[PDB]
Amino acid sequence: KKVAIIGAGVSGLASIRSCLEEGLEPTCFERSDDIGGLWKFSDHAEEGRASIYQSVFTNSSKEMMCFPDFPYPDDFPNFMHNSKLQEYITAFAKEKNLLKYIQFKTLVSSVNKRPDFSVTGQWDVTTEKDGKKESAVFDAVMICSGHHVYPNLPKESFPGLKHFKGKCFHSRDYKEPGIFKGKRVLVIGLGNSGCDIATELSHTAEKVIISSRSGSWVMSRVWDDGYPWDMLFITRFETFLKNSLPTAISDWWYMKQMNARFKHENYGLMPLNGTLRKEPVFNDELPARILCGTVSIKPNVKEFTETSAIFEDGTVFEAIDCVIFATGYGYAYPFLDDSIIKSRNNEVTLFKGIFPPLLEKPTLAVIGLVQSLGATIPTTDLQARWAAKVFANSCTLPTTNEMMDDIDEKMGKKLKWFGQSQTLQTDYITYMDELGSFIGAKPNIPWLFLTDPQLALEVFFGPCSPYQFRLMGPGKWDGARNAILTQWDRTLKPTRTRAVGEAKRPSLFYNLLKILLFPVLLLAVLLA
Amino acid sequence: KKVAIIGAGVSGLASIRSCLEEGLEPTCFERSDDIGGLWKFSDHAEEGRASIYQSVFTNSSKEMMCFPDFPYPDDFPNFMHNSKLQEYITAFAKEKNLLKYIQFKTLVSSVNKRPDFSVTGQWDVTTEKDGKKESAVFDAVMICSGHHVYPNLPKESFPGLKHFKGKCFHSRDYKEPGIFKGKRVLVIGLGNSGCDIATELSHTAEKVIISSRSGSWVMSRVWDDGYPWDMLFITRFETFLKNSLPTAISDWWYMKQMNARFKHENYGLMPLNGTLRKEPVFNDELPARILCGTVSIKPNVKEFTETSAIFEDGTVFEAIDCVIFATGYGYAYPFLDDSIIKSRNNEVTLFKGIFPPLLEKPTLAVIGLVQSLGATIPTTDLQARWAAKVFANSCTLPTTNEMMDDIDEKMGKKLKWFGQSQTLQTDYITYMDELGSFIGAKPNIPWLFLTDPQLALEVFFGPCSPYQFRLMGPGKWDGARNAILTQWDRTLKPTRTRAVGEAKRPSLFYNLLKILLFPVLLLAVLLA
Ligand SMILES: Cc1cc2nc3c(=O)[nH]c(=O)nc-3n(C[C@H](O)[C@H](O)[C@H](O)COP(=O)(O)OP(=O)(O)OC[C@H]3O[C@@H](n4cnc5c(N)ncnc54)[C@H](O)[C@@H]3O)c2cc1C
Ligand SMILES: Cc1cc2nc3c(=O)[nH]c(=O)nc-3n(C[C@H](O)[C@H](O)[C@H](O)COP(=O)(O)OP(=O)(O)OC[C@H]3O[C@@H](n4cnc5c(N)ncnc54)[C@H](O)[C@@H]3O)c2cc1C
Ligand SMILES: NC(=O)c1ccc[n+]([C@@H]2O[C@H](COP(=O)([O-])OP(=O)(O)OC[C@H]3O[C@@H](n4cnc5c(N)ncnc54)[C@H](OP(=O)(O)O)[C@@H]3O)[C@@H](O)[C@H]2O)c1
Ligand SMILES: NC(=O)c1ccc[n+]([C@@H]2O[C@H](COP(=O)([O-])OP(=O)(O)OC[C@H]3O[C@@H](n4cnc5c(N)ncnc54)[C@H](OP(=O)(O)O)[C@@H]3O)[C@@H](O)[C@H]2O)c1
């Protein structure tokens, strides 16, 4: 029953609550004095903790990034300031009575198999508190220590950088644009950090450049008809199509969508390989900032000088005041023997990104080491539900090489779809469904068409909103049906503060992507 | 031959150069020590002068807002910082040798018909210089004193405003957002000033609201396929359609376009009367700022309190720190008898916005008192060409009531199209064509379709770029043809700083707006 939970960020909180709903006895160790982890802004980056800049807004929609049984307030904006999310996370801990189970100011310094591990499956958790080390035995462990904390910072990768006389640092340490007024800034990396920092700087800096290896597709929070992108883009029907179409048709369809608003070619953003379903950039400002000549995109940096950067196409950025490395993150687990997670090819091998296979007893779970178009909060809520049930012997894992087979197959899919077997990227609805099956909470679409087809349609054709994953099966929420059916109400409410039109909600009586298909395939193969 | 020119802004400079090309002897009086007028930023609003805030970017494209014979440098951004335009204006004055003819630091204090005006048609121009009045006789006068200087500020229009204890001022005096950090700001007016100031503030203010009577359509610099809006939207063909379609079809087509990117209804921007071809808002940030909950739109203010504003729908904005009136401008001419310009119904009456009819001899011209989707620079270049020719007795006006008839007809059209007979708004290509005819510089589309049909097509179906207005007829430029044919090169060059795609210039072999009409009118009325 005793479960150690490392971290009180979103992953940890999800874990505590899932432990409680399976009658386990959770203890959550948090090295700082607050919950929310990454989402609580602070002026200075702390070691071992993620570090966000002040102007971060969610890039997932509110109706897509709530705990499935706890919607965001009706009046909340669809995309929220970091502080607004912190407020919600805090609300959720309070509501679900999770604070009891958290020991703050306690670092977990090591986690070690018990000497009798093959028969008990217990763990020795060591925790440094006031400078005072301690130790205790737990039946299971949940690692919720995050993967946006240890910067990926290839210093040793750029010829000449040693010589550069200006200030130079990583996305992690960017906070406010104040001190950059009329400065010359180069940003390395066309990620969401890179683009946010570049566009923000572009309002006050003298000149700003983003250097990109591979380019990137760029989407926006404001999508078709001003609806949040993810409520339109992440759909069981849309996933059905991209899953079960000739991959040349599907690859075509994807690139059409991504390149519809503006021609990436003309803006210097066109990805080297546009078929890759890599996580896109979500950034509303960037095209305008580029067209107004406040940001330009260049290829990778070839060489630095004392004062300059020269790019792979020959051009030069003179008199650079500052270089920002917006080059992403790795991940670590300093408190754990490398052999547990990296149990093969010196490479992270986890069943469904969660359970290390080879483990004699399934009593360690990694929560939140998974990236999709979908949001962390709903993803981790599901991960935790499953891990909690595995710990309570209510579910059991498949066999050891059943799991390794799955891992091998997934690494192959990952290379195909993302160009990396080692990425954390996965297809959201697919992943959510796999885990859904394991705990019997995958919504039965057909059973719905047959009883309550209104809901069935909104579930399949509409947003793959978190509510759906606590609709039926154990741990379901009674609010779920109502929540799904009122999701567009909550989306349209806050934005319509001057009522002149009639509010326009999306129609299912629509098929916007089936008029130039099944009708034109109905006058073509109705003639020949 | 002696012509007095009041002001050395864009209108004045256009006037000086047109005077020179008709052999007149221009004298330009400029109250300040520099040219460019409104476009040269300064920290503090000067009396009698326009006043711009620091972050103003052009909302017209470079290939649409150059003097027709002087394109912007190849590398210039399609939309430019105010300082960049100042640089171009300065380049133009230098190149065309206009500085000789400007007396700086000289205010024009009055302009008076000579006592022998009915025979000579001359003018007494009085100018204060060093506190030192002088006076001189001129054959003609060109008024180029602008119409974005005297703020429209309805103080006694808002019940309770006298009592409001917070700071309160007009768009004119907004400059930097620094001092508004975490302040609560209400902005009155959903014009381009209002929206710029609101969105800028929304990055650092605590809360920002825009109050709008009537709402507004909102376009963006980044239009279809990332091309500048005006290069796509302002087209002879497009004007042909909206001119000669049943006005209910055309009104439908206009609203479809404006409401395509996002549903104004849902964002609180929907205009009270969406058929009105009022100048739209050009603003790239606003939808995202609204969707992120940093800006919300409310109806008109009903009542102010000591500390609050209450809106027509009952809601309230508590603890307002600052109210910004972004409520536009009127216009004046303090140096001129009211009877000259307002020569009827105590209402501005000018033939083609330029010549006061009733004037015994046509020796006074107002330059730049005209607004369209088109840009001031090309518009005033044409106005000045005509006025200069009228002054040199190379052209002559129609009869006095021929002109009044035209004014009456125009005021009717204005009420129909804009809901105001008194607006400065007019249809760009129509106006440019009328003036074109008068000086024999209206491009002969048919003659082109017959000789050089490549050019003919780009002139008619492509952007109504300034080049086209000095293509044929007197005062033409030989660079014009080449300029028109390379306009997309100059648009795409600066923005494509990382070459991965193939650059995508637009096709005429396209008709993007002819596939759901001439085909559906080809299976429907191809059956019945
Ligand atoms: C700039 C940025 C924006 C993002 N925006 C979005 C978005 O809009 N939508 C979205 O879904 N996701 C977003 N993400 C992804 C984000 O990572 C997740 O939403 C989520 O916050 C990660 O939560 P976590 O609990 O797994 O990690 P963290 O928040 O990093 O949680 C780790 C916690 O454990 C503690 N801890 C670490 N090590 C130890 C130890 N050894 N002992 C004890 N305690 C420890 C830390 O103090 C922290 O409290 C964003 C990430 C970044 C960087
Ligand atoms: C914020 C803003 C953005 C704009 N953006 C655009 C745009 O992108 N594109 C566009 O086409 N238009 C734009 N406009 C419209 C703009 O008005 C024109 O581009 C143009 O600047 C107008 O020039 P002007 O010569 O008529 O008047 P002004 O620029 O006001 O110049 C008038 C000159 O007359 C002088 N003057 C006035 N009275 C006297 C006197 N008695 N004696 C001597 N001198 C006098 C003043 O010192 C000044 O130098 C914008 C306007 C604003 C406010
Ligand atoms: N909510 C928000 O608005 C928001 C804001 C910021 C971040 N986030 C989230 O946090 C996560 C991390 O984003 P991030 O920008 O910090 O990291 P990221 O998504 O991993 O981006 C890293 C960027 O730098 C490039 N890069 C990596 N190593 C490089 C090297 N050695 N040389 C040159 N370029 C290199 C990568 O390009 P390749 O693809 O070519 O490697 C990529 O463009 C994302 O999921 C993001 O969505 C969210
Ligand atoms: N290049 C740029 O980016 C840029 C930036 C700013 C301005 N400009 C240009 O400068 C010009 C002026 O723009 P602007 O915003 O200053 O002024 P404006 O275009 O005249 O707009 C004024 C706004 O305030 C409203 N208003 C006027 N009187 C009011 C009252 N008594 N109560 C409530 N509302 C009232 C108007 O309402 P109605 O709509 O109901 O009349 C309108 O929404 C335009 O040509 C504009 O394009 C350009």
CB-based contact (8 Å) between A285 and chain B? Answer: yes
CA separation for the pair B391, B24 (Å, rounded): 8
Same domain? A317 vs A351:
no
Q: Which residue of B has its CA nearest to A56?
A: B292
Task: Name residue A76's amino acid.
Answer: F
Instruction: From chain A, pick out residues whose CB is under 8 angstroms from the CB of B215.
Output: 498, 500
Q: How far is CA B138 from CA B14, B28, B112, B132, in A?
A: 19, 12, 10, 19
Please, what's the b/e burial string for B33-66 (b: 16 or more CB within 10 A of its CB; e: otherwise)? Answer: eebbbbbbbeeebeeebbbbbebbbbbbbbbbbb
Same domain? A100 vs A19:
yes
Establish if B173 belongs to a structural domain: yes
Neighbours of B167 (CB within 10 A): 13
* Residue of A231, A292, A498 to mutate for B, most B C-beta atoms under 10 A: A498
- Shortest distance, CA A22 to any CA of chain B (angstroms): 37
HEC string for A99-147: HHHEECCCEEEEEEECCCHHHHCCEEEEEECCCCEEEEEECEEEECCCC
* Residue of B85, B88, B291 to mutate for A, most A C-beta atoms under 10 A: B291
Same domain? B157 vs B302:
yes
SS3 B265: helix
Establish if A314 belongs to a structural domain: yes
Same domain? A166 vs A306:
yes
Task: Name residue B483's amino acid.
Answer: A
Q: How far is CA A38 from CA A35, A147, A192, A323, B195, in A?
A: 9, 10, 15, 24, 33
Same domain? A182 vs A288:
yes
Establish if A465 belongs to a structural domain: no
- Which numbered ligand comes closest to the C-alpha of A301? 3
| Strands A296-298 and A207-211, bridge-based pairing | parallel
The residue count of chain B comes to: 528
Alpha-carbon Rg for chain A in angstroms: 24
Establish if A528 belongs to a structural domain: no
- Shortest distance, CA B81 to any CA of chain A (angstroms): 8
**Structural domains in chain A (count):** 2
Establish if A506 belongs to a structural domain: no
SS3 B463: strand
Q: Find all residues with CB under 8 Å of B506, minimum gap 6, and list them.
A: B225, B227, B232, B488
Q: How far is CA B344 from CA B270, B340, B401, B404, in A?
A: 36, 9, 13, 10
Q: Which of B403, B437, B471 is the last residue of a domain?
A: B437
- Residue A299 CB–ligand 3 contact under 6 Å: no
SS3 B516: coil
Q: Which domain holds residue A306?
A: 151-220+266-328
Neighbours of B272 (CB within 10 A): 12
Residue whose C-alpha is closest to residue A375's, from A33, A44, A88: A88
Check CB contact under 8 Å for B495 and A265. no
Task: Name residue B389's amino acid.
Answer: K
- Which numbered ligand comes closest to the C-alpha of B171? 4
| Residue A378 main-chain phi, psi, to 5 deg | -60, -30
CB-based contact (8 Å) between B23 and chain A? Answer: no
Spatial contact of A10 and A370, defined as CB atoms under 8 Å apart: no
The residue count of chain A comes to: 528
CA separation for the pair B257, B416 (Å, rounded): 20
CA separation for the pair A35, A32 (Å, rounded): 8
Q: Find all residues with CB under 8 Å of A69, minimum gap 6, and list them.
A: A470, A477, A479, A480
Residue whose C-alpha is closest to residue A431's, from A420, A448, A417, A452: A417
CA separation for the pair B449, B456 (Å, rounded): 5
Establish if B490 belongs to a structural domain: no
Check CB contact under 8 Å for A262 and B293. no
Same domain? B270 vs B158:
yes
For A291, the closest of B221, B313, B500 (CB atoms) is B221
Concatenated DSSP letters of A213-272: SS---EE-SB-TBT-BHHHHHSBHHHHHHHHSS-HHHHHHHHHHHHTSSB-HHHHT---S
Same domain? B336 vs B316:
no
Separation of B146 CA from ligand 2 center, angstroms? 5
Nearest-atom number in ligand 2 for the CA of B38 is 29
CA separation for the pair A119, A121 (Å, rounded): 6
CA separation for the pair B362, B139 (Å, rounded): 10
Instruction: From chain A, pick out residues whose CB is under 8 angstroms from the CB of B203.
Output: 55, 203
Residues forming beta bridges with residue A356, ordered by sequence position = none
Spatial contact of A210 and A298, defined as CB atoms under 8 Å apart: yes
CA separation for the pair B95, B83 (Å, rounded): 18
Lookup: tokens for A15:
């874990």
- Distance spanning both ends of chain A, measured CA to CA: 68
Same domain? A278 vs A162:
yes
Lookup: tokens for B103:
């007396």
Separation of A173 CA from ligand 3 center, angstroms? 15
Separation of A270 CA from ligand 2 center, angstroms? 39
Task: Name residue B343's amino acid.
Answer: S
Same domain? A184 vs A320:
yes
CB-based contact (8 Å) between B232 and chain A? Answer: no
Same domain? A53 vs A35:
yes
CA separation for the pair B127, B136 (Å, rounded): 9
Q: Which of A412, A437, A462 is the last residue of a domain?
A: A437
CB-based contact (8 Å) between B285 and chain A? Answer: yes
* Residue of B229, B265, B492 to mutate for A, most A C-beta atoms under 10 A: B265
Lookup: tokens for B63:
């290939």
HEC string for A32-52: CCCCCHHHCCCCCCCCCCCCC
Task: Name residue B132's amino acid.
Answer: K
Place of tokens 């006037």: B15
CATH label of the domain that carries residue B196: 3.50.50.60
- Residue A59 CB–ligand 1 contact under 6 Å: yes
> How many CA atoms lie within 13 Å of A215's alpha carbon, on the beta-carbon side?
28
CB-based contact (8 Å) between A76 and chain B? Answer: yes
Check CB contact under 8 Å for B292 and A268. no
- Which numbered ligand comes closest to the C-alpha of B129? 2
B-facing residues of A in 163-222 (CB < 8 A) are: 203, 212, 215, 220-222
| Residue B86 main-chain phi, psi, to 5 deg | -55, -40
- Shortest distance, CA B232 to any CA of chain A (angstroms): 14
Check CB contact under 8 Å for B265 and A503. yes
Helix (H) or strand (E) holding B2: strand B2-6
Q: Which residue of B has its CA nearest to A226?
A: B262
- Residue A58 CB–ligand 3 contact under 6 Å: yes
- Which numbered ligand comes closest to the C-alpha of B234? 2
CA separation for the pair B68, B92 (Å, rounded): 12
Establish if A27 belongs to a structural domain: yes
Sign of CA dihedral A438, A440, A445, A447: positive
For B498, the closest of A80, A84, A268 (CB atoms) is A268
* Interchain CB contacts (distance < 8 Å): A and B: 177
Spatial contact of A426 and A370, defined as CB atoms under 8 Å apart: yes
Q: What is the largest CA-CA distance in chain B?
A: 83
Neighbours of A523 (CB within 10 A): 9
Nearest-atom number in ligand 1 for the CA of A8 is 49
> How many CA atoms lie within 13 Å of A357's alpha carbon, on the beta-carbon side?
18
Resolution as reported, in Å: 2.8
For B268, the closest of A215, A296, A498 (CB atoms) is A498
Same domain? B38 vs B81:
yes
The torsion region of residue A501 among left (phi > 0), alpha (psi -120 to 50) and beta comes to beta
| Strands B316-317 and A107-113, bridge-based pairing | unpaired
Q: Which of A404, A437, A470 is the last residue of a domain?
A: A437
Establish if A321 belongs to a structural domain: yes
For B298, the closest of A494, A497, A501 (CB atoms) is A497
DSSP 8-class letter at B163: G
Pocket test for ligand 3, best of A85, A175, A193 (most atoms within 8 A of CB): A193
Spatial contact of A433 and A442, defined as CB atoms under 8 Å apart: yes
Helix (H) or strand (E) holding B302: strand B301-304
Nearest-atom number in ligand 1 for the CA of A109 is 41
Same domain? A64 vs A24:
yes
- Residue B114 CB–ligand 4 contact under 6 Å: no
Residue whose C-alpha is closest to residue B471's, from B463, B62, B458, B479: B479
DSSP 8-class letter at B427: -
CA separation for the pair A367, A379 (Å, rounded): 9
